Design a protein around this ligand. Structure first.
Ligand SMILES: *[C@@H]1O[C@H](CO)[C@@H](O[C@@H]2O[C@H](CO)[C@@H](O[C@@H]3O[C@H](CO)[C@@H](O)[C@H](O[C@H]4O[C@H](CO)[C@@H](O)[C@H](O)[C@@H]4O)[C@@H]3O)[C@H](O)[C@H]2NC(C)=O)[C@H](O)[C@H]1NC(C)=O
Ligand SMILES: *[C@@H]1O[C@H](CO)[C@@H](O[C@@H]2O[C@H](CO)[C@@H](O)[C@H](O)[C@H]2NC(C)=O)[C@H](O)[C@H]1NC(C)=O
Ligand SMILES: *[C@@H]1O[C@H](CO)[C@@H](O[C@@H]2O[C@H](CO)[C@@H](O)[C@H](O)[C@H]2NC(C)=O)[C@H](O)[C@H]1NC(C)=O
Ligand SMILES: *[C@@H]1O[C@H](CO)[C@@H](O[C@@H]2O[C@H](CO)[C@@H](O)[C@H](O)[C@H]2NC(C)=O)[C@H](O)[C@H]1NC(C)=O
Ligand SMILES: *[C@@H]1O[C@H](CO)[C@@H](O[C@@H]2O[C@H](CO)[C@@H](O)[C@H](O)[C@H]2NC(C)=O)[C@H](O)[C@H]1NC(C)=O
Ligand SMILES: *[C@@H]1O[C@H](CO[C@@H]2O[C@@H](C)[C@@H](O)[C@@H](O)[C@@H]2O)[C@@H](O)[C@H](O)[C@H]1NC(C)=O
Ligand SMILES: *[C@@H]1O[C@H](CO[C@@H]2O[C@@H](C)[C@@H](O)[C@@H](O)[C@@H]2O)[C@@H](O)[C@H](O)[C@H]1NC(C)=O
Ligand SMILES: *[C@@H]1O[C@H](CO[C@@H]2O[C@@H](C)[C@@H](O)[C@@H](O)[C@@H]2O)[C@@H](O)[C@H](O)[C@H]1NC(C)=O
Ligand SMILES: *[C@@H]1O[C@H](CO[C@@H]2O[C@@H](C)[C@@H](O)[C@@H](O)[C@@H]2O)[C@@H](O)[C@H](O)[C@H]1NC(C)=O
Ligand SMILES: *[C@@H]1O[C@H](CO[C@@H]2O[C@@H](C)[C@@H](O)[C@@H](O)[C@@H]2O)[C@@H](O)[C@H](O)[C@H]1NC(C)=O
Ligand SMILES: *[C@@H]1O[C@H](CO[C@@H]2O[C@@H](C)[C@H](O)[C@@H](O)[C@@H]2O)[C@@H](O)[C@H](O)[C@H]1NC(C)=O
Ligand SMILES: *[C@@H]1O[C@H](CO)[C@@H](O)[C@H](O)[C@H]1NC(C)=O
Ligand SMILES: *[C@@H]1O[C@H](CO)[C@@H](O)[C@H](O)[C@H]1NC(C)=O
Ligand SMILES: *[C@@H]1O[C@H](CO)[C@@H](O)[C@H](O)[C@H]1NC(C)=O
Ligand SMILES: *[C@@H]1O[C@H](CO)[C@@H](O)[C@H](O)[C@H]1NC(C)=O
Ligand SMILES: *[C@@H]1O[C@H](CO)[C@@H](O)[C@H](O)[C@H]1NC(C)=O
Ligand SMILES: *[C@@H]1O[C@H](CO)[C@@H](O)[C@H](O)[C@H]1NC(C)=O
Ligand SMILES: *[C@@H]1O[C@H](CO)[C@@H](O)[C@H](O)[C@H]1NC(C)=O
Ligand SMILES: *[C@@H]1O[C@H](CO)[C@@H](O)[C@H](O)[C@H]1NC(C)=O
Ligand SMILES: *[C@@H]1O[C@H](CO)[C@@H](O)[C@H](O)[C@H]1NC(C)=O
Ligand SMILES: *[C@@H]1O[C@H](CO)[C@@H](O)[C@H](O)[C@H]1NC(C)=O
Ligand SMILES: *[C@@H]1O[C@H](CO)[C@@H](O)[C@H](O)[C@H]1NC(C)=O
Ligand SMILES: *[C@@H]1O[C@H](CO)[C@@H](O)[C@H](O)[C@H]1NC(C)=O
Ligand SMILES: *[C@@H]1O[C@H](CO)[C@@H](O)[C@H](O)[C@H]1NC(C)=O
Ligand SMILES: *[C@@H]1O[C@H](CO)[C@@H](O)[C@H](O)[C@H]1NC(C)=O
Ligand SMILES: *[C@@H]1O[C@H](CO)[C@@H](O)[C@H](O)[C@H]1NC(C)=O
Ligand SMILES: *[C@@H]1O[C@H](CO)[C@@H](O)[C@H](O)[C@H]1NC(C)=O
Ligand SMILES: *[C@@H]1O[C@H](CO)[C@@H](O)[C@H](O)[C@H]1NC(C)=O
Ligand SMILES: *[C@@H]1O[C@H](CO)[C@@H](O)[C@H](O)[C@H]1NC(C)=O
Ligand SMILES: *[C@@H]1O[C@H](CO)[C@@H](O)[C@H](O)[C@H]1NC(C)=O
Ligand SMILES: *[C@@H]1O[C@H](CO)[C@@H](O)[C@H](O)[C@H]1NC(C)=O
Lengths: 124, 419, 120, 120, 120
């Protein structure tokens, strides 16, 4: 069984910063690309950021492009996201997900295979 | 859906024949590579063969030619205490030698082995050197040793040598443990016939290698897993003299012998030799039946160069009779002494147009060496006899574990990447 | 990790050692050795010329515009990249190689001509 | 369609067989043959070096930033590419080859320096 | 203005004559001369191969993504480029040559993989 567990932050003031992280187990971490998907309390899903399995390539939705950093650590089976300037509009559940990309010699993905349960980030 | 992607630096190779180079006074394991080896089709053997012969000939290029000695010789019996085994073996020959000045001659006498001279017109008094009717003789330089100094064979860039590490490998087929080496280990170019000397030993068991074991036309190369020590000697104290035969050209010869005249010989331990054969017999029965008979016998015929065990012992050339080693039938502190003949005029390689004179060596000669393998031929009851006339077999016994391949770094494969 | 160390590895792993092998391609008595050095150079240059013709000069991994034909090999990506070694792959597609090379050459000629027109 | 098959065709046709000619540039008794082979390699390398200097490495058709001078040749494009062969053209401008090469080298030196500053 | 004329000039001036030196790298009795020519070619090719591996093929000036470590040399830009000759500089950092070369190779290998993924 694949498990993705978010261990995020809580309530933070507007204009501050908050870091999320996700621990993964049950699969070869290094074989998959990962992403963060956001869900505002009253909305559907939105893609936020995507990172390559080697950690070299990152992509962002324009609305966080100059504010969020997505990173990865393959020795610790850890995915992380550092958010800055925290707008009120960034209140959401942030889900850790596996999928969204694959790399050259692998078959394609372009969908998400596994989901964590999500950390709730609230901006005051 | 998929596109062609070009890769360069791909770890792929093909069998190839290239020129290897020598070096004289590093290994990658290749974890999951299995490769097919085929000794007897190994072109490294041919290169070693040609390099040894070429270098051999180069070493005689600056040496004194003995053509000025193709004269009639008057030969009498030796005035010494000669044992029965040596009767008729040596002759005391007198002749007129050229000297430093063309208008002068000198009378010289020397001792020769009977095998180096041939009577003329059935005249007891008149004899001549064996090579005079055939090609002219050349004296080997006294400053040049015959020591089998090892040679390493190294690949040129773009090529690699693969080494087989399977301890039970019999010379052909897949080898489950293969490593890449930059250059081979040093191989000693020891020259011998029916018994291989100073080679590598098998790691665990006696290994019998043959291109086709059931084809009696093929030679069988047997690698031992234990050495048999052999002690060879020529127990005669030789006094060596020299004369000038030309302008700075010296000729060396045995002047006389101090003390009694005895036959040269080699010793092996009787029990060690018997145990060694027992192991060979045991392995032969894996190719032949179990309830069988294996008989060993002496060489059936041919000249001295193929019916005896030939080797260079301290610079002298010995031709030993091995019938005492191969005389038994195997059905389902003693030693063996092998008498030896000595020759000074030899051909070395199985060639017609060349002949070398080996200068005699001062004093008494003793050499000790290891028997590391045998060359056998085959005729119920199977009979095996010593063989080994072809030198390429000696070199195969060391080169069987190496293969040369060419690196082919370019290749293609499908990926999902497109320009 | 040395020369050909990855030869027994799968294609997707061996592909990470391309510089290890690339660097080991370059470095009368004495003539046969001189001939060997000259020949090694000519061989090397032919492969480099070929990469140039295909538009892959200067790189070890080159993506092209020639589609892969299932008739050359119908194996899928996992089946190839995470299962086969390069020696096995090379044997499988050997017959169809001189077809692939011809296609790569034709593709590059068209690309260079199109680029030239786009620069008018 | 073989090597130099296009030699009698016009420049606009011959320009399509560049790979045919490029691939035919590479491949005591026996020494003079080595001298020829070593020399053939050095010749090849000098041309490749020159393309590198001009910034045309890796391609058979290369556009540059050096303008054409009417003093070298005042023929128009429909004349040169459609009613002339490469052998004829080579003779027509054989006196300006060194001038043109000098200009191409200078152009690239300036181009490399400008790119370096833009990457600051 | 000839070969090595700038050898005594500062690094920031000498760098403008790179084509002068690049063009002077290429062109039993008679054998030792063939050996010298063959080796000159192999030397040349090894340097070109190395530029290829680092992603600098085809150019005399190449920027990379490897940061300069202050431990190799802690001199500032005026000390290195406004004064200092290339001969002096090479001696100053000769002990870090292999470290730098190893880093350049690693950087390019990562660059190639990222580029391949961005095209799939
Ligand atoms: C199998 O291997 C053994 C072990 O290596 C080998 O035995 C060795 O043979 C050589 C002769 O070929 C012996 O070397 C001599 O040793 C004596 C005593 O020190 C020296 O006086 C000799 O010097 C003369 O000869 C030299 C040329 O070889 C001249 O340069 C010198 O000026 C002298 O004239 C010479 O060094 C060596 O001692 C033995 N080793 C042992 C342990 O006995 C055997 O020959 C090999 N068998 C075969 C068939 O190859
Ligand atoms: C080989 O023949 C020579 C020549 O006949 C022998 O030399 C002579 O020996 C006698 C003694 O028997 C001496 O008095 C002479 O002075 C010797 N002559 C010369 C020229 O030296 C020689 O002894 C014979 N050798 C053998 C082994 O038979
Ligand atoms: C060595 O030289 C001597 C002298 O040259 C030879 O002596 C010969 O002896 C007989 C006996 O009288 C003479 O008839 C010959 O005239 C001599 N020969 C000549 C041609 O001088 C002796 O035969 C020579 N030995 C050999 C075998 O060459
Ligand atoms: C090879 O074996 C023979 C025996 O057959 C050895 O000869 C004996 O050697 C001792 C010591 O010198 C003498 O006392 C004996 O009289 C010899 N016996 C015979 C029958 O001759 C010989 O020494 C051994 N040696 C080698 C190869 O060096
Ligand atoms: C080794 O010596 C033996 C003698 O001990 C030689 O064998 C003899 O050969 C003759 C002629 O064929 C036979 O009539 C004898 O019956 C054989 N004797 C024995 C005991 O078998 C043998 O030829 C010699 N071998 C070499 C290579 O010299
Ligand atoms: C690749 O195909 C696998 C099944 O392979 C079967 O056996 C091989 C030897 C071929 O004959 C092939 O055509 C057969 O279908 C699947 O199990 C695997 O999931 C597939 N992988 C991908 C990425 O599509
Ligand atoms: C174009 O060429 C003009 C003439 O140069 C001279 O004639 C040519 C054919 C060559 O032989 C050349 O070596 C001679 O010097 C120059 O005056 C003019 O500056 C050049 N052009 C441009 C566009 O700058
Ligand atoms: C190209 O030139 C053709 C011929 O023009 C005449 O001959 C040449 C060699 C020059 O001397 C020129 O000055 C002469 O007028 C024309 O027929 C053709 O139309 C021209 N092409 C274009 C596109 O204008
Ligand atoms: C920068 O250099 C630091 C000092 O280490 C010394 O220099 C390196 C290049 C080696 O030669 C080493 O053996 C010497 O002791 C390193 O500790 C540091 O990690 C380096 N940092 C970067 C970014 O390269
Ligand atoms: C660059 O460095 C110049 C010289 O600084 C002094 O000498 C060097 C060799 C070192 O030992 C350094 O620690 C010394 O202070 C300065 O004059 C110059 O201002 C510096 N450039 C800049 C932009 O600050
Ligand atoms: C794909 O391949 C189809 C069949 O294969 C053709 O014949 C075999 C024997 C050759 O080895 C192969 O290279 C040939 O292509 C063709 O009919 C089809 O046209 C090809 N399609 C493309 C896009 O190349
Ligand atoms: C030679 O042998 C005889 C016996 O036939 C013997 O009397 C004589 O002493 C021996 N010669 C020498 C020098 O010992
Ligand atoms: C000389 O030796 C031979 C053997 O080669 C022998 O037959 C002959 O009788 C001997 N003659 C003399 C005088 O000793
Ligand atoms: C040399 O003479 C011997 C003995 O008569 C003979 O057998 C051999 O064939 C001859 N060799 C040549 C080349 O004449
Ligand atoms: C013979 O074998 C022994 C085994 O202990 C070895 O030490 C010795 O060097 C070998 N001799 C030769 C000449 O190979
Ligand atoms: C060597 O081993 C191979 C194993 O495939 C076998 O086919 C061959 O017959 C064997 N040859 C000998 C002489 O044992
Ligand atoms: C091996 O030898 C046998 C004779 O026992 C022969 O019939 C067979 O054809 C030979 N095979 C090969 C491959 O040489
Ligand atoms: C050979 O000589 C060695 C000493 O060098 C000795 O130990 C060994 O027993 C001898 N072997 C035989 C068969 O005489
Ligand atoms: C050789 O082996 C046979 C095996 O039948 C044995 O009878 C004989 O006594 C052995 N000889 C020696 C010297 O060990
Ligand atoms: C031959 O004997 C060995 C034991 O030495 C045995 O393992 C093998 O099975 C026997 N082979 C046959 C055909 O009887
Ligand atoms: C072989 O052994 C027999 C005894 O079994 C013996 O009579 C014969 O002379 C020996 N042959 C040789 C060449 O030693
Ligand atoms: C050979 O005889 C000479 C006589 O001067 C002696 O000095 C030398 O030791 C002897 N050599 C041998 C090996 O008997
Ligand atoms: C060889 O195969 C084993 C699996 O049996 C694998 O664990 C090992 O990494 C492979 N070796 C190499 C060099 O790829
Ligand atoms: C290799 O292919 C077989 C096809 O049946 C598949 O079951 C196996 O999982 C594959 N192994 C890898 C590493 O892709
Ligand atoms: C190429 O075709 C031949 C046709 O006989 C076949 O035997 C060989 O295995 C093929 N090689 C491949 C599949 O590359
Ligand atoms: C040669 O000239 C004729 C016109 O006379 C033309 O049709 C033909 O295509 C030309 N040859 C080539 C190779 O272009
Ligand atoms: C050459 O010029 C004429 C006009 O004078 C034109 O009709 C013809 O098509 C041109 N040539 C070629 C070879 O295409
Ligand atoms: C090139 O220059 C020479 C003088 O060296 C002149 O005779 C020739 O006509 C010129 N070439 C052309 C095409 O004008
Ligand atoms: C040599 O140094 C002087 C300053 O001392 C400078 O004016 C001159 O241009 C320099 N020459 C070269 C070739 O760098
Ligand atoms: C270069 O300038 C600096 C700063 O003035 C000085 O310390 C250094 O010694 C000068 N250079 C050389 C190459 O000697
Ligand atoms: C380079 O290393 C040598 C040997 O340790 C040392 O003597 C020398 O000072 C070092 N050079 C530099 C610039 O650090």
């Amino acid at each position: 069984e694949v498990q993705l567990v978010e261990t995020g932050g809580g309530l933070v003031q507007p204009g501050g910063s908050l870091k999320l992280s996700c621990r993964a187990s049950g699969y070869t971490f290094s074989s998959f690309a990962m992403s963060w998907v956001r869900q505002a309390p009253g909305k559907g899903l939105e893609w936020v950021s995507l990172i390559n399995d080697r950690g070299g390539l990152t992509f962002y939705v324009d609305s966080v492009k100059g504010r969020f950093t997505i990173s990865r650590d393959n020795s610790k089976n850890t995915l992380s996201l550092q958010m800055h300037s925290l707008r009120d509009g960034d209140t959401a559940v942030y889900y850790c997900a596996t999928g969204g990309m694959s790399s050259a010699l692998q078959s394609s993905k372009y969908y998400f295979d596994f989901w964590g349960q999500g950390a709730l980030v609230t901006v005051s | 859906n998929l596109w062609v992607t070009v890769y360069y630096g791909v770890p792929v190779w093909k069998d190839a024949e290239t020129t290897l180079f020598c070096a004289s006074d590093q290994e990658i394991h290749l974890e999951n590579v299995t490769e097919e080896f085929n000794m007897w089709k190994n072109n490294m053997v041919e290169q070693m063969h040609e390099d040894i012969i070429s270098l051999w000939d180069q070493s005689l290029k600056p040496c004194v030619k003995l053509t000025p000695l193709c004269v009639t010789l008057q030969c009498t019996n030796v005035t010494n205490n000669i044992t029965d085994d040596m009767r008729g073996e040596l002759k005391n020959c007198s002749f007129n030698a050229t000297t430093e000045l063309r208008n002068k001659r000198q009378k010289v006498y020397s001792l020769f082995y009977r095998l180096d001279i041939v009577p003329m017109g059935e005249n007891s008094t008149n004899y001549r050197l064996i090579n005079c009717n055939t090609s002219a003789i050349t004296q080997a330089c006294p400053k040049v040793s015959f020591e089998p100094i090892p040679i390493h064979y190294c690949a040129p860039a773009g090529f690699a040598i693969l080494k087989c590490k399977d301890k039970k490998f019999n010379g052909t087929g897949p080898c489950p443990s293969v490593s890449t080496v930059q250059c081979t280990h040093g191989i000693k170019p020891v020259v011998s016939t029916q018994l291989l000397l100073n080679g590598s030993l098998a790691e665990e068991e006696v290994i019998i290698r043959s291109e086709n074991i059931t084809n009696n036309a093929k030679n069988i190369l047997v690698q031992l897993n234990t050495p048999v020590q052999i002690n060879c000697t020529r127990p005669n104290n030789n006094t060596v003299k020299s004369i000038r035969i030309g302008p700075g050209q010296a000729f060396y010869y045995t002047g006389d012998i101090i003390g009694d005249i005895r036959q040269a010989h080699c010793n092996v331990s009787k029990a060690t030799w018997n145990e060694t054969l027992g192991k060979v017999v045991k392995q032969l029965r894996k190719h032949f039946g179990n309830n069988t008979i294996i008989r060993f016998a002496q060489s059936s015929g041919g000249d001295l160069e193929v019916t005896t065990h030939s080797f260079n012992c301290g610079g002298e050339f010995f031709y030993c009779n091995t019938s005492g080693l191969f005389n038994s039938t195997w059905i389902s502190n003693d030693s063996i002494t092998l008498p030896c003949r000595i020759k000074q005029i030899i051909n070395m390689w199985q060639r017609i147009g060349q002949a070398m004179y080996a200068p005699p060596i001062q004093g008494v000669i003793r050499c000790v060496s290891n028997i590391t393998g045998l060359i056998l031929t085959r005729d119920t009851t199977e009979t095996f006899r010593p063989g080994g006339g072809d030198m390429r077999d000696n070199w195969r016994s060391e080169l069987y574990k190496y293969k040369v391949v060419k690196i082919e770094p370019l290749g293609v494969a499908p990926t999902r990447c497109k320009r | 990790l040395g020369f050909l160390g990855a030869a027994g590895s799968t294609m997707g792993a061996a592909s990470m050692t391309l510089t290890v092998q690339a660097r080991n391609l370059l470095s009368h008595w004495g003539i046969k050795q001189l001939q060997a050095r000259v020949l090694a150079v000519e061989h090397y240059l032919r492969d480099q010329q070929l990469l140039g013709i295909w538009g892959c000069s200067g790189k070890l991994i080159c993506c092209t515009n020639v589609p892969w034909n299932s008739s050359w090999s119908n194996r899928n990506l996992s089946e190839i990249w995470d299962n086969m070694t390069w020696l096995q792959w090379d044997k499988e597609i050997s017959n169809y190689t001189q077809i692939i090379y011809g296609l790569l050459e034709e593709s590059q000629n068209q690309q260079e001509k199109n680029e030239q027109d786009l620069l008018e």
